[PDB]
Amino acid sequence: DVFRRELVDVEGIPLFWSIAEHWSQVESFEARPDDILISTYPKSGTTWVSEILDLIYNNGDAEKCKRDAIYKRVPFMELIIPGITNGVEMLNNMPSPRIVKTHLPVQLLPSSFWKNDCKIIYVARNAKDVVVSYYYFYQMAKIHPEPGTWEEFLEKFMAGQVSFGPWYDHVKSWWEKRKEYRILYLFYEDMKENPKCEIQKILKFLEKDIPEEILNKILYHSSFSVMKENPSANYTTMMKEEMDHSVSPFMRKGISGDWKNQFTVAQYEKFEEDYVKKMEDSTLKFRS
C-alpha cells in the first residue's frame, strides 16, 4: 500500500515516503531560465494560481486549458509515487516555457532554480484557514498519514509535524528569500478581495501586457465557481485510491474565514498566542 504511510524526514522536513526514497531526482532537478515556479505551503492557493498562469500562457483560451488535468499541465515537481506519478519525469519531458509547482521549504528547493535565477510566484494564506483546508485534504488525499481528529491534527500543525513541515517557517523563509531572487509574494486573501488587481500583479511580474478583454477571460475562468465544476481543474480525474472526493471535495469552500467554523474559541486563543511568538519578529503580515 503506497497510501497512508508515515512521513519520512528529508533534510529536517517530513515528506511523503516516496519523495524521500527518490530524493536524488528532486535534488538534481534541472531547471531552465524561463521556468516559472509556483511555490506554496500546502492549501494556500496553488491550484488557483496554477490555473491563472496556464490561462495567461494560453491567452485566456478555456479549451486549451482543458488539454489535460491541472496536475499534468503544471506538474507537482517533487511528487513521486511508485506506480502512480513522477513530477520530475513529467517536467523533464515538458517543452518550455514550463510552469512548475512545488511545496518545498526554501532550504530544500533544488539548487538549479537558484542557479538559473528563475522567477518564482509564492502564494501565502493565513495559517488558520490553511490548517482547516489541510485537515480535510489529509482526509481525502490518501498519500497523507491519517490526520486523526481535528484536535489532534491542529496540534500536529502547530508543531510542524505535517507534510512539508511547519507553516510558520515556510512562509517566513520564503518571504526572506524575496531579497535574493525574483519572488512575487502573493496572498490568498488579496486574491479573494480583488482578483483582478492580483492577476495584474502577476502579468507585470511576467512582463506581459495583454488586452483588457483577455484579462477578463482569465478572471472569469479562474473564479472558484468555474474551477469547482471544471474537471480539468478540480482533481476529480484523480484515481479514487489517491483522492476520494466523497470524503471531502478538493474544491471545498474557496473562502477566507472558514477557520471560524472549525476552531473552538479556546483553540483559537491558544493558536493566536502560539502564532504571535513564532511570527512577531517577521515583517510578514496576514489577514484572516
Ligand SMILES: Nc1ncnc2c1ncn2[C@@H]1O[C@H](COP(=O)(O)O)[C@@H](OP(=O)(O)O)[C@H]1O
Ligand atoms: N479559484 C479559487 N478561488 C478560491 N479558492 C480556491 C480556488 N481554487 C481552489 N481554491 C481553494 O484553495 C485550496 C486548495 O489549495 P491548494 O491548491 O494550494 O491545494 C482549497 O481551499 P479550501 O479547502 O479552504 O476550500 C480550495 O477550495
